[PDB]
Amino acid sequence: DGKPIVSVLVVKRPATDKIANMQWAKDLEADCDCKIEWQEVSEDAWAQQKNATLAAGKIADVSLHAFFPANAAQFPGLFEDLSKDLDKMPNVKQFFKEKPDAQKLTTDPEGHMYALPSSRGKSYSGTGQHMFINKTWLDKLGLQVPTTWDELENVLKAFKTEDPNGNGQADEIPMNIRKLDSYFTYYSPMLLLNSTGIVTGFNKGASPTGFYAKNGVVKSFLTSDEYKQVIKYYHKLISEGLIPADWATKTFDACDTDQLSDGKTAKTGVSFGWSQDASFGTLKDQYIPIPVPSAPGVSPDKTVWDGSSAEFEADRFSLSSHAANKDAALKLANLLYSEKYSVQQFLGSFGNLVTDDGNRHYTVDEDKYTKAMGDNLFPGLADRFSGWIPDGVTIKGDVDGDNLLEANKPYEEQRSHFDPVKDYIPDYVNPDPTDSNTLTNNNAQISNVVMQKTATWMSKGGIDEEWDAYCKQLDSLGLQENVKIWQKWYDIYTKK
């Protein structure tokens, strides 16, 4: 009937229904006055297909949750520069007016923008990283929350030997940490770098690859005395039986299973995670988030916490430079970023899980939402969505957001001890394609050494006599080139 056709690739979150089954998606298509040809792929499948898809240039007119700015920069002629199209996307302009750092996240210093970001809203503006302790155990044993590494060690020894869970067995895991990966992961044991006065940023960006900033100067922590001290502290704890001896080989899932236990008997004293509910389930009311204990020599005021933000994602809309109907595709973007469709993508269709109460207020049926997730039939895109939640919108019943907001309250003090520009490499610092390839190539070799030596030194000792050779080895693999590259782009993005 003459309507423009727009092909839309959507990389899907797990546990979601098919998009064609979602009422809001049918509404969106009607409101666009176009025909949408949806193509859905899992995240695991997309990870394996993305490079071949780019190399072949076989891209859909619109792709959601598919391409990051770094990907478009490596294949620039493939994608429309959306910075030139903002007048056809007034709802995106409003997003960028209210949240200017979201625009920076996908815009290069030359001003091109090949991807739109998303925002899941102000409940997610804090970090995803937290340190939890079993407060019920502290209370039963007559211990205060620890505020130094020495006090933490003392608490963990008490957890180990004093049977705080009351079952008579020495089953308590005083502190549980995740194994290492080729980058510093969510909930990394290296969150203890914050104890030393180095701000981590482990949600995303340069920090997972070993970089930080202080006073406007970029450095690598991989060769810092601070990193050495964290490793030595962990080795002390491990050697004392306060962390599982096989921590380095346990799967992330197995580590999570330790903390969840059977839902009735708590097993773990201290762990890193997202929220008490996600980490501990029905055991959550025993656990609180605590400020990180200070390392020796570091005052409370100089002790920091991870500076990340869980709010924005950078890969949420890209338009093929050869799409036939770009006006229809830009209208689709504009509608995705309207309140009507941003809320329905994030929480599902109105009248299914979420009620539009008027006055920019929405209410989620919490039990129905969890059941939809459990059934693998979530009627939206959830946190993988392509849209934005404005600060003027209030949502009642986004339990994950409420949980994260609460988990972040204890970290406002420590996060206030650093400058978010001068003491943190901002999430929007995007090296160009040539420098990105240098970084990634060097990081591939650096990471093998770091991961092997770090795990060995934590488990078995040896750091003091091997440290100098390790530092020289990382330099031979280009670490100092990488530091200088990050300093350059940090300066371009943050300094006049």
String of DSSP letters for 149-187: HHHHHHHHHHHHHS-TTSSSSS--EEE--PPP-SSPPTT
- Quote the crossing angle between the two packed helices 479-494 and 463-476, to the nearest 10°: 70
Report how far residue 426's alpha carbon sits from residue 419's, in angstroms, rounded to the nearest whole number. 11
Do 35 and 90 lie in one domain? The reply is yes
Final resolution, Å:
1.5
Spatial neighbors of 456 by CB under 8 A, at least 6 apart, are 462
Burial readout 143-165 (b: 16 or more C-beta within 10 A, e: otherwise):
beebebbeebbebbebbbeebbb
Cα angle, residue 420 at apex, residues 418 and 423 outer, rounded to 5° = 60
Name the experiment that determined this structure: X-ray
Containing 368, the helix (H) or strand (E) segment is helix 366-374
Task: Give the contacts of 276 (CB within 8 A, at least 6 positions apart).
Answer: 132, 284, 285, 287, 288, 289, 403, 407
Verify that 267 and 356 share a domain, yes or no.
no
Of the candidates 156, 233, 151, 159, the one whose C-alpha atom is nearest the C-alpha of residue 190 is 233
Do both 357 and 445 map to the same domain?
no
Q: Choose the final residue of a domain: 395, 417, 441.
A: 395
Is 379:23 a contact under the CB 8 Å cutoff? yes
Phi, psi of 359 (to 5 degrees): 55, 35
Among candidate residues 366, 395, 424, the one where a domain is terminated? 395
Q: Of the candidates 395, 429, 450, which is a domain's last residue?
A: 395
**Residue 249 maps to which CATH number?**
3.40.190.10
The total domain count for the chain is 2
Q: Hey, what are 259's tokens? A: 């903390």
Alpha helices in 182-280 (DSSP H): 225-239, 252-260, 276-280
Which residues are CB-neighbours of 371 under 8 A, at least 6 positions away?
Answer: none
For β-strands 62-64 and 5-12, DSSP reports them as parallel
The residue whose two tokens read 């007034």 is 90
User: Do 116 and 131 have their domain in common?
Assistant: no
Structural domain for 356, as ranges? 1-123+311-395
Q: Are 329 and 265 part of one and the same domain? A: no
